[PDB]
Design a protein around this ligand. Structure first.
Ligand SMILES: NC(=O)c1ccc[n+]([C@@H]2O[C@H](COP(=O)([O-])OP(=O)(O)OC[C@H]3O[C@@H](n4cnc5c(N)ncnc54)[C@H](O)[C@@H]3O)[C@@H](O)[C@H]2O)c1
Ligand SMILES: NC(=O)c1ccc[n+]([C@@H]2O[C@H](COP(=O)([O-])OP(=O)(O)OC[C@H]3O[C@@H](n4cnc5c(N)ncnc54)[C@H](O)[C@@H]3O)[C@@H](O)[C@H]2O)c1
Ligand SMILES: NC(=O)c1ccc[n+]([C@@H]2O[C@H](COP(=O)([O-])OP(=O)(O)OC[C@H]3O[C@@H](n4cnc5c(N)ncnc54)[C@H](O)[C@@H]3O)[C@@H](O)[C@H]2O)c1
Ligand SMILES: NC(=O)c1ccc[n+]([C@@H]2O[C@H](COP(=O)([O-])OP(=O)(O)OC[C@H]3O[C@@H](n4cnc5c(N)ncnc54)[C@H](O)[C@@H]3O)[C@@H](O)[C@H]2O)c1
Ligand SMILES: CCCCCCc1ccc(Oc2ccccc2C)c(O)c1
Ligand SMILES: CCCCCCc1ccc(Oc2ccccc2C)c(O)c1
Ligand SMILES: CCCCCCc1ccc(Oc2ccccc2C)c(O)c1
Ligand SMILES: CCCCCCc1ccc(Oc2ccccc2C)c(O)c1
Lengths: 268, 268, 268, 268
């Protein structure tokens, strides 16, 4: 009955019940997946939030900048799912960029220390998670990361745009390695969604009238998308990730699927 | 429970049992879809062939160069599915190019009458099919066409490459129109499949070493594809089309999904 | 001293002194090129207009839909430049689309007869001109066509967008053939310029407030371009074509150079 | 009359006489440019090497990881060219990636400290160079960086591919900033050149069969390039950079010009 019935899927990146990762998890459970969740830093909050999911799942700590976390991850996952069992899916839904790299802060004024942290967490970690988890993935499995189309420059997105360009390149190399395991690796380039990162990171860096410029972003996206766009609903994006986690896109890898209402296909 | 359970899907483009359309149809039926078939010219042959599908489906005649077939199509489909009922999906799996625009035959020697017929059938008709059928499609519905990545030139594909470039452009305009119906329009860019068109029609224009060149094509595509590629197997491509016809990719339109083993994402 | 000193260059597509082809010619002559001009239909007007160029050049009739014109072209050119002499450059600056294929006229309502004519003239003719002229081009030579970025759908451009997508594919195949002669083939994707086609074809199809929507197009383009954009000046575009005609881009072929103020590299 | 007659151009990235920068510098000088050179670490060696350029040029030290070098660069360049004078051109020909992120060394085994150093030098520093030098550039000026098409993954280029993806994104944001100065920013995507970095640094990480693999690379690139390709010859690439530094591409910014023999436009 369910799209992901019996599949074992690790989902990273829940911070709140607005997180793209929250809705990926919710939809995957509705579709029968058995999940292992990973969280960063604010584990007490994340435990509270993940209790709003349809079903209980183990929560494991994972700071992608922490070499020890990464080194122990496959073992901790194997403890969570049981020896002899492997993952069928991995979801990377993780990003960060310091305020200097975002918004109205001048592009040239971001120190490399800041950019590097943003790139570590937002791009490099996709390789490092694939490295840790591929040895415990089943053939036919699927690794999915979250992208925002960086093909053209734009206001505010600034150095996160650079990190996503890097992520897209990483994805294609992860696909090379994953292929050896019979595993797919893809990115979902999503339209704008009202998440914590959108409000705290992107919004925080926009200065004043941020709420209006964000309302503006929604209205422009909605206009450009032939099927419209709603920033208040992550479900279409979560369903898309779930399609990639399923057996229904078996010949797609190294690739990007655009869950953006088709906005990137239209000039105006 | 099937991926496509309860959905009404029109599938064009069956001519042989090796046709991509034939496999899209089989998989759609295994996933619970009710089909309406359309066929060109050899309707007795198509009728016979499709008696070997999992389930019986009505078959209607459609020559996309015949403006009368196109003018009557919606009413004919309505009769086939029952008045009041609408289509949830449309599959355009239609291609033609005179052999003169293909193979070892010189690119410059294809006369425009030939090229134009190919473009008419291969690209323009995606818009005329959508024009005819959009008025009888449900919101949430899905139009899917078949592509072969024409972003780069290549031996032998010649003027068909040009027609696929046109088609990708047509798809994006179709999406604009389909969106007003709450309908999606996308293409599936498939890797090479050992269909009789590939082997016999195109392989027809390929010379005395055609068989070897086709095996060589397979070997190279399989090398390049991080997850491998089997030209003998249409199933991954048909599953990809079904994915688009399902409700699992609801924010994707005007777009292209590559079902090519990830080959296009790799240089070597 | 001149960029194109001693080079023999055929320039097609002058209709008025606002034509992109007019400015290509003007700039090429300023840079020392010896030109052969081709014109369509309105030869008396074109003769008057081409008398405003810095220097005299032979004018030859060429309707790209006329098989006889095309068949006699190399011979007529050889008569214009002298036996034993060959062309170093060819400029395709030609396009057409009937009103049904443009503007506010519904996309689905363009008859294929119309689209086909537009595609013949705007895309297919790039191959047919290359076919006629390559046998009289010097190695090191350069064929350049004019493009408008069709990667995304947009209002008004409609079926001309499809023709340019087709042109881009043709260009990459012409590059295959041209390479055998030691000749480059490239397209210049220009920003919007106030030419006859812009006003009569694009403007004519836009209905009412066309002048304001065109003013609007300029202002949006100017905003999106990091170095700004001026629709009233074709010179930056002509200089770009001249760069391609020169010896200064010797390793570029099958390709597209964007003379659009960088607008296509910016989302907003 | 030289292409670059009277222009003042800063050229970074000479380390050996096989350096792409070395050839850009030679060609620029043959075309009448006045150069300022910048070099990293081995300044005595660079001084010696560049004594073999057509013309003597001042050489300044620049480690792009040294924020003091970057803070003083504009003033140091001004002293070199004379106060009141400004630069017309800047060439970023700087790349680095620890061998650990290259060759037959496993993609997953490159530690982030290594990758980050590579990204810093290879991508971030394009923005910090532009930051430093924009204030002393003339309108109409041109910043040019060196790229290797990273749109697809590939053997051996590994993390450098990721850094070039980042760089292409950085280029587009640099263009936004440079436009306020009336300055252009573009990359040249070069085909493989048998520079000592290619052979010795990268070829260093390539195994016991490295030489053969490099010849194989050349043979395949030459096959794919419609106009052919010679890895032994930097001249076409240097001419391409000079083209961008000239006034002949004045509407192009935030962009990428492929000097690769047209290889990227061909599948096979
Ligand atoms: N919201 C949008 O509009 C949008 C659009 C396209 C793509 N995305 C992408 O979706 C993904 C999820 O972001 P979101 O929008 O759901 O916002 P979010 O705030 O809900 O999630 C971001 C996650 O990043 C995690 N994270 C940060 N640093 C980490 C670290 N060192 N280790 C482990 N995890 C870390 C945070 O814990 C948080 O859970 C990101 O890749 C984001 O770039 C978002
Ligand atoms: N076989 C491959 O490797 C491959 C790869 C990528 C894309 N494609 C595309 O997939 C689609 C299916 O091709 P296939 O390989 O299954 O070949 P096919 O010959 O089985 O299918 C082509 C269909 O086009 C139909 N057709 C031709 N003229 C028509 C007309 N005037 N009106 C209506 N229908 C007409 C034919 O009847 C046939 O049913 C085509 O668009 C093709 O370009 C094929
Ligand atoms: N004006 C712009 O904004 C713009 C932008 C990008 C690309 N372009 C391209 O520039 C090229 C030149 O157009 P333009 O804008 O200078 O307008 P234009 O009206 O000055 O030139 C169009 C030319 O097409 C020629 N032509 C039409 N049918 C022909 C035929 N059958 N045979 C031979 N020639 C024929 C006409 O004679 C005319 O000289 C076209 O390819 C156009 O698509 C224009
Ligand atoms: N060789 C090729 O085939 C090829 C192809 C495409 C692009 N490229 C690019 O061309 C550029 C030139 O490479 P090359 O092949 O001439 O190799 P190279 O080794 O001659 O040049 C690289 C330059 O990077 C400089 N550099 C390294 N670290 C630096 C630092 N911290 N500060 C300042 N400078 C530093 C080195 O000193 C050297 O001068 C690089 O960006 C490279 O990626 C090379
Ligand atoms: C106005 C800027 C353009 C629209 C932003 C849409 C967006 C919103 C949030 C996103 O997530 C992040 C962004 C930056 C840093 C970290 C994260 C998770 C993200 O990746 C994309
Ligand atoms: C030429 C070698 C390149 C690989 C061929 C892959 C392919 C095979 C068949 C295809 O379909 C057609 C092609 C031409 C004419 C008609 C059809 C259905 C098609 O569109 C693509
Ligand atoms: C509002 C539409 C989008 C901007 C149009 C810019 C433009 C203007 C003129 C062009 O030339 C032609 C256009 C259509 C048909 C024929 C030609 C020559 C052309 O190719 C492009
Ligand atoms: C790996 C095989 C792929 C072809 C290599 C072409 C190439 C060669 C050299 C290049 O420059 C560098 C690469 C890595 C580190 C430093 C430099 C300068 C570079 O950027 C690209």
């Amino acid at each position: 009955t369910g799209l992901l019935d019996g599949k074992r899927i690790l989902v990273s990146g829940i911070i709140t019940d607005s997180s793209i990762a929250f809705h990926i998890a919710r939809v995957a459970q509705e579709q029968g997946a058995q999940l292992v969740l990973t969280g960063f830093d604010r584990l007490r909050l994340i435990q509270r939030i993940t209790d709003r999911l349809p079903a209980k799942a183990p929560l494991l700590e994972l700071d992608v900048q922490n070499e020890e976390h990464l080194a122990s991850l496959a073992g901790r996952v194997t403890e969570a799912i049981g020896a002899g069992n492997k993952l069928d899916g991995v979801v990377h839904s993780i990003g960060f960029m310091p305020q200097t790299g975002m918004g109205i802060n001048p592009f040239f004024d971001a120190p490399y220390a800041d950019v590097s942290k943003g790139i570590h967490i937002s791009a490099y970690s996709y390789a490092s998670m694939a490295k840790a988890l591929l040895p415990i993935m089943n053939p036919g499995g699927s690794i999915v990361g979250m992208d925002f189309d960086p093909s053209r420059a734009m206001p505010a997105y600034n150095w996160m745009t650079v990190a996503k360009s890097a992520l897209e390149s990483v994805n294609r190399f992860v696909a090379r390695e994953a292929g050896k395991y019979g595993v797919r690796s893809n990115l979902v380039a999503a339209g704008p969604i009202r998440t914590l990162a959108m409000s705290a990171i992107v919004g925080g860096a926009l200065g004043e009238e941020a709420g209006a410029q964000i309302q503006l972003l929604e209205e422009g996206w909605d206009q450009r998308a032939p099927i419209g766009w709603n920033m208040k609903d992550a479900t279409p994006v979560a369903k898309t990730v779930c399609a990639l986690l399923s057996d229904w896109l078996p010949a797609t890898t190294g690739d990007i699927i655009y869950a953006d209402g088709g906005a990137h296909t239209q000039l105006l």
